[PDB]
Design an enzyme around this catalytic site. Sequence first.
Site, mmCIF file in Angstrom:
data_model
loop_
_atom_site.group_PDB
_atom_site.id
_atom_site.type_symbol
_atom_site.label_atom_id
_atom_site.label_comp_id
_atom_site.label_asym_id
_atom_site.label_seq_id
_atom_site.Cartn_x
_atom_site.Cartn_y
_atom_site.Cartn_z
ATOM 1 N N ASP A 36 0.812 -1.155 -0.117
ATOM 2 C CA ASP A 36 -0.076 -0.066 0.007
ATOM 3 C C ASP A 36 1.067 1.327 -0.211
ATOM 4 O O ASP A 36 1.452 1.494 1.059
ATOM 5 C CB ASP A 36 -0.968 0.129 1.124
ATOM 6 C CG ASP A 36 -1.940 1.272 1.259
ATOM 7 O OD1 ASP A 36 -2.166 1.678 0.200
ATOM 8 O OD2 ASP A 36 -2.344 1.290 2.236
ATOM 9 N N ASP A 216 -1.503 5.768 -5.674
ATOM 10 C CA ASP A 216 -1.916 5.037 -4.678
ATOM 11 C C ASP A 216 -2.298 3.422 -4.899
ATOM 12 O O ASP A 216 -3.434 3.003 -5.797
ATOM 13 C CB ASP A 216 -3.175 5.625 -3.935
ATOM 14 C CG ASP A 216 -3.614 4.896 -2.656
ATOM 15 O OD1 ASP A 216 -2.931 3.693 -2.229
ATOM 16 O OD2 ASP A 216 -4.573 5.311 -1.872
HETATM 17 C C1 LIG Z 1 -8.225 -4.613 0.586
HETATM 18 O O1 LIG Z 1 -8.004 -3.355 1.537
HETATM 19 C C2 LIG Z 1 -7.105 -2.702 1.474
HETATM 20 C C3 LIG Z 1 -5.910 -2.986 0.545
HETATM 21 C C4 LIG Z 1 -4.765 -2.050 0.429
HETATM 22 BR BR1 LIG Z 1 -3.396 -2.699 -0.561
HETATM 23 C C5 LIG Z 1 -4.773 -1.018 1.543
HETATM 24 C C6 LIG Z 1 -5.764 -0.754 2.294
HETATM 25 C C7 LIG Z 1 -5.776 0.518 2.954
HETATM 26 N N1 LIG Z 1 -5.511 1.676 2.465
HETATM 27 C C8 LIG Z 1 -5.256 2.792 3.378
HETATM 28 C C9 LIG Z 1 -4.848 3.908 2.633
HETATM 29 C C10 LIG Z 1 -5.938 4.367 1.613
HETATM 30 N N2 LIG Z 1 -5.457 5.662 0.904
HETATM 31 C C11 LIG Z 1 -5.810 6.979 1.265
HETATM 32 O O2 LIG Z 1 -6.319 6.971 2.538
HETATM 33 C C12 LIG Z 1 -5.687 7.938 0.563
HETATM 34 C C13 LIG Z 1 -7.109 8.180 -0.303
HETATM 35 C C14 LIG Z 1 -7.085 7.585 -1.724
HETATM 36 S S1 LIG Z 1 -8.565 8.185 -2.441
HETATM 37 C C15 LIG Z 1 -6.228 3.179 0.641
HETATM 38 C C16 LIG Z 1 -6.499 2.205 1.355
HETATM 39 C C17 LIG Z 1 -6.934 -1.533 2.376
HETATM 40 O O3 LIG Z 1 -7.758 -1.390 3.105
HETATM 41 C C18 LIG Z 1 -8.047 -1.703 4.360
#
Ligand SMILES: COc1cc(Br)cc(CN2CCC(NC(=O)CCCS)CC2)c1OC
Length: 344
Positions: A36, A216
């Site tokens: 991530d 991202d």
């Molecule tokens: C399947 O579930 C995930 C998979 C992965 Br690979 C990463 C995550 C967590 N991650 C936390 C940061 C988030 N991005 C932001 O806050 C910026 C805004 C963007 S519009 C994106 C999601 C996940 O969620 C739990």
Amino acid sequence: GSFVEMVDNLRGKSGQGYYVEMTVGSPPQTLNILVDTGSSNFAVGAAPHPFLHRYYQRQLSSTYRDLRKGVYVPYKWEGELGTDLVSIPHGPNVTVRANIAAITESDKFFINGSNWEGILGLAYAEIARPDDSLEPFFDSLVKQTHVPNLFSLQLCGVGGSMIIGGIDHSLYTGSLWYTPIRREWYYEVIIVRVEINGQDLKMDCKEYNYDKSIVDSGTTNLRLPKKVFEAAVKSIKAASSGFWLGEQLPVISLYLMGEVTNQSFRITILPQQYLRPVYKFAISQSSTGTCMGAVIMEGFYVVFDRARKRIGFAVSACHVHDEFRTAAVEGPFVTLDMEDCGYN
Ligand SMILES: COc1cc(Br)cc(CN2CCC(NC(=O)CCCS)CC2)c1OC
């Protein structure tokens, strides 16, 4: 040049992100870990949650050290902070002492049916929790080893490659084009122009980056700000004549700020990128800004050149293309007043 060991080291399910195999503790405990670039914490399941295949068992690790502190991370999960020895089997042959949040409690984090047990935040300390004093894994890796301050991602529509410490030139075609990292918190970039099938949206470029624009890997969709999203879909719907709102089941070009004054380049994604096979429309609205998720990243080999505070884009050797249209990275273009596009 070439990193054969690290090629094809990522797996995942469509819409669930990409994961890499990692080991924690001594003797090594193998876990699958989400990659991530939108977050900065290294966190793993530490308790027998029903959805989990496996979990970090601190009591089995001789090298574990307690930091006697707790962390609460909402998007939620909650954890106990510590340090232990971490390795990436299909990565560099090194072992570092890194911070690990041992997840003890979570809501809507782990997915029922998934094959991953944790998350690796590759973004910077600024957005780390509880605060910036907790050193992210990659910052620890660079400081403790001779691994260069750079990683790259080739996400393919589900598997891919995370090349740690370098670039594998087999994974892209053409040239790499670099955009500056505006601020080292998220992987923040500046979009200066947006075209829908060759036509400019004529919108103020300040709107394309309203709040922020980021690369991202943790986000599945290309997430455009409300105003930009509205105008984009309007041109998307007009090009082909609930669904557009993400409530049910023509190339797109983003111009990025270049390395040089008044110089930009464009990255171009096909329908084969924003039509996610479930098909679904993989472009949604956002209130946090522009999020260049797997939709964008699956068209490109992406170089997170942390050493030079820049992100490289090149056409991916694994991107889905036909005989008609292919994904593209093209430049240079002349774009004036690019600095204005950055939100303050
Ligand atoms: C399947 O579930 C995930 C998979 C992965 Br690979 C990463 C995550 C967590 N991650 C936390 C940061 C988030 N991005 C932001 O806050 C910026 C805004 C963007 S519009 C994106 C999601 C996940 O969620 C739990």
